[PDB]
Design a protein around this ligand. Sequence first.
Ligand SMILES: Nc1ncnc2c1ncn2[C@@H]1O[C@H](COP(=O)(O)OS(=O)(=O)O)[C@@H](O)[C@H]1O
Ligand SMILES: Nc1ncnc2c1ncn2[C@@H]1O[C@H](COP(=O)(O)OS(=O)(=O)O)[C@@H](O)[C@H]1O
Ligand SMILES: Nc1ncnc2c1ncn2[C@@H]1O[C@H](COP(=O)(O)OS(=O)(=O)O)[C@@H](O)[C@H]1O
Ligand SMILES: Nc1ncnc2c1ncn2[C@@H]1O[C@H](COP(=O)(O)OS(=O)(=O)O)[C@@H](O)[C@H]1O
Lengths: 572, 572
Amino acid sequence: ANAPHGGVLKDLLARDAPRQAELAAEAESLPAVTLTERQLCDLELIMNGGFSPLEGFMNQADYDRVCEDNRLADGNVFSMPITLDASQEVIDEKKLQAGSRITLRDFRDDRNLAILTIDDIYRPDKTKEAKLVFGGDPEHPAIVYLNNTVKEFYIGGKIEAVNKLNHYDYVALRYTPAELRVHFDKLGWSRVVAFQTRNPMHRAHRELTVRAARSRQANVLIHPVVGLTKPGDIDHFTRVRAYQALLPRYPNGMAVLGLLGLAMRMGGPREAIWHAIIRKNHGATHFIVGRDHAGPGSNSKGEDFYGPYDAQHAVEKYKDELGIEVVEFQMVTYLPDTDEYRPVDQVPAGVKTLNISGTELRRRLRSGAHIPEWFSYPEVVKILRESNPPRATQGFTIFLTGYMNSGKDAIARALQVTLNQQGGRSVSLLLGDTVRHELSSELGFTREDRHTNIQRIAFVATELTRAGAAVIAAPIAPYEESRKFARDAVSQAGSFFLVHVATPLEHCEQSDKRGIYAAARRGEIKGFTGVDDPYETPEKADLVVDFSKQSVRSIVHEIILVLESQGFLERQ
Amino acid sequence: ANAPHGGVLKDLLARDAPRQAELAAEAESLPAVTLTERQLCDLELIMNGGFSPLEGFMNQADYDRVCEDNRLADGNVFSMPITLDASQEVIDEKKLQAGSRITLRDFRDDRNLAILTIDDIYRPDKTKEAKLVFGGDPEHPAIVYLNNTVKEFYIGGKIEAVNKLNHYDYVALRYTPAELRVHFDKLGWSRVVAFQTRNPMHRAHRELTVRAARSRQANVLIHPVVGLTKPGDIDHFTRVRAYQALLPRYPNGMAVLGLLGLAMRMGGPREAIWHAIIRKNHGATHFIVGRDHAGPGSNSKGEDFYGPYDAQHAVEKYKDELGIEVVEFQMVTYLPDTDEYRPVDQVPAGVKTLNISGTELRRRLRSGAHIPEWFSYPEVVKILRESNPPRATQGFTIFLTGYMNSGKDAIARALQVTLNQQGGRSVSLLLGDTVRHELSSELGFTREDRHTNIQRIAFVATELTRAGAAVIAAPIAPYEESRKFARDAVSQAGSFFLVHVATPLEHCEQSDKRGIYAAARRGEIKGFTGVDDPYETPEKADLVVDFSKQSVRSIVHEIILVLESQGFLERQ
Ligand SMILES: Nc1ncnc2c1ncn2[C@@H]1O[C@H](COP(=O)(O)OS(=O)(=O)O)[C@@H](O)[C@H]1O
Ligand SMILES: Nc1ncnc2c1ncn2[C@@H]1O[C@H](COP(=O)(O)OS(=O)(=O)O)[C@@H](O)[C@H]1O
Ligand SMILES: Nc1ncnc2c1ncn2[C@@H]1O[C@H](COP(=O)(O)OS(=O)(=O)O)[C@@H](O)[C@H]1O
Ligand SMILES: Nc1ncnc2c1ncn2[C@@H]1O[C@H](COP(=O)(O)OS(=O)(=O)O)[C@@H](O)[C@H]1O
């Protein structure tokens, strides 16, 4: 191990252990504030010493010296603002003011975690934070969070610990700075290189780590983030399973896997200084920083937020103040002819190098294509495939919208039979009327009530899509707002296709065998779509059909052809 | 977890941690006694609380109450004598007497471990121990140890801790009662069934453990012995590797593997009470006792030392005093027709049951034959095969003995060429003269010097055999004593074959082209085998040949045929 940053490990949970009962009791009495997931990651690392010397959510004095000088008021280096935000309504409703004692509660199990004592309650310049800490790009994940999720005020204050967060996943692999230190001891280690990561580890990474181990004569701590990462990365359960598949590739007893409940910001260079501090608090003697450490890639105009290696420079600016040795690496690649990996600054400008990008990997994962062993070990690839299956087995939703009696309900049942013939997956059919009877029996037909209904279809459709089913829904869905809502939700889990059954109102009305359009026409049914209520025509549907000009059979054939072109009907 | 036996966990290492430096210094000054491997297992468990309430090697008061009442003088149950034996010569040479302070040293790295303060120094009745503790059979492993390894006197006394033993194998899987308890906590466990074992775990055992887990609503602690076990079991590195291959067969986070540095005695029933105590000290809430727990099978006259289930009765006699719940099991077997396992007391006397015995398993391992998956998981079997390979790849030693110039040296070189033709393994040729030049250049030809020489051949032959080589040695080897020594050593690692080149002395002498027999005959070489020194004719060799009647070629053919009949020349 190594000494904590600042000299004292701020293990608030060990400090306040003797007062637990009392603190608990006192916590039942104060006004409680319930934490967001990101504040819960921060609170966990504060309470266990991970953010030493910090020992509570930053007050303005501390905050400002970081927002601009990468230091805490006490002078210690610290590059990342760690604050507890709240809205004016909560500040008032709870009567929060300096010197107040609030309880911080776990939204997951309602437990009282800590008691914070307010120093101040300031309103920060979200623009200067945006710009001074996370570069300035509005597309940057941290900045987007800063504006859309972070409330208006920051409540600074020291923390006293009531309970350690509960976690039900991987408890034996989670460690507090104190526990990890005791472990390095139990193992008899003295020099430990820590490896940060928010992705599955491939061949190249196994090499960085063994290289660092060999060069610094150190043991390896694979220390992945399991809290919050970049917006769309592979879930942590898949990643942990992947890190575990990799362990057997190191010589017996050389590496140890320990999980870090950090909530990354993707602050590139700053986040890198921050990471070094954290690993030092956890007891690592060395820490790897490679290409694009903690970087979130590039923005929409294709410009990338930080340059490669900038984070290595930043962590370098404080070589003398960060009490942990950084081990640098340049992009590592594969040399086919020699069958080896090395940093680019070691390949003779004439030698052949291979590399599979993020995009190429997703392409192969999606298509079922082979992924080279020089790239990633077999057991790892297997795990990745189990989580990101090919289109051949992914679920999807076919969303149908059109006037009542436009043929959308017959098209839906035929598509269902057709896909059951096709065979790949379980097919769930949600006909407008079925949804109305089974899920929305009590809603009405007001714009708000219809919107609610379509949201209900989307909630169900998303869970079925996530389980790999083929969901077929055919409600009227008059408003573009509900439809886009539907599409956004399902898209979180898989493909969503909007098929607009644009059969003309006259046709629909003239063939209604249930005299519903009739009753509407004689005012027995108020606000009926097409007669009273509107029908916002879909602007950019994936497919437009007409039961006036095409038959159920060929409309079905057209939908099938779309699923086919995108690989959903391939063989599993 | 659960409370220690006696109420206080005797963690001598945690107790004396604050005095470490002082104790260390004082330990450099007292007369030190170096521990045997079994005393080192006992010392480790004493110092870490595993044997709580015990806190040193038993003095007579404690000893006697166990030798006969299964209790320590303080009344607590304790069925196994734990003592530190010494010989009169050490007791005198060191001047040990009551009130003396000796240092206990680790023979492995010379470290000073503990300081013992002598209460007494008594001479125990090895016959009453033999009989009252380990039944009475002279073939029993404990008893054989008691008489052949245990010295004459037992030195009783409390212990103070200087250093915890060092171990270089599996440090992350080794646990002290304190560490395991902290771990059960970290994992959030409360009820824990511990499983004792000194063998690889097969399908049947995975079932006992899941059954106990399900019935007592408990988590599983696979707690194998890694100290000293029954005389010929599978080495602990192979077993640990096997337990690790098994873990993935339990549902995620249900079992934990922790190693126990116990030195078993194979005391059946008593050892079982003992084990319950130990597991309780380690914090387990329940402990499994099955068929023949801690039993060492049967003696030579085929009578088995303890009956099945006797140990379950014994641990039952103290149900009220052992503060840990025993979970009993009757022989568990495989029901082919249903493909399931259950205790025999659940198979309808008409149902079909399958079982592979220890012998059948060794038979298959030795022959390369398939081992059913209903019996043992695939990954486990693989590991067992890597450690106990078929005769096809085992090493072996061909030991040749006969008069100087009997043809033994030509037979040896031809056998070498022949086996190199054959191909399976690396062949090491140790011709008498080569051994004499390379290993024994300075020995003479006195009975003692020859014996030393043959021991040197055996040391080298054993290591090569262990590495799977074919060793061919052809020294004269005049004395049966040396030859039996040779055979015993190699037999520890693989097969040893004695080929007696019984070519008659006249023939040998008459064809000596080096005039050595000549110089012996004219007294220029004193004590020459056959002329002066004797040649103890081999009584039970594996093969007897004569260069007078057979040719090198067919003698070689006869040896090859023997290796073949035993499976060494099969294909790998
Ligand atoms: N091919 C590579 N060559 C060198 N360093 C790399 C390579 N891939 C990743 N790294 C570095 O290894 C760690 C792996 O990072 P990732 O999990 O991809 O994302 S990050 O946000 O944690 O940096 C970071 O230190 C990163 O800079
Ligand atoms: N005011 C109404 N407008 C349209 N359909 C109605 C109305 N009142 C009842 N219905 C009936 O309810 C179903 C329409 O339900 P949905 O498709 O669920 O409509 S949506 O607006 O929420 O998309 C059809 O059976 C239709 O005949
Ligand atoms: N087939 C079996 N059925 C029931 N109990 C068994 C079986 N095999 C072993 N056991 C029990 O499980 C543990 C395994 O013991 P072994 O490693 O074979 O040897 S022992 O010396 O530790 O008992 C002991 O409790 C033993 O009694
Ligand atoms: N006194 C002796 N008896 C037998 N062989 C001898 C003697 N002195 C020298 N030699 C030579 O040493 C070799 C005998 O050595 P070994 O086979 O090593 O004998 S053994 O007694 O130790 O088995 C042969 O070369 C032999 O000619």
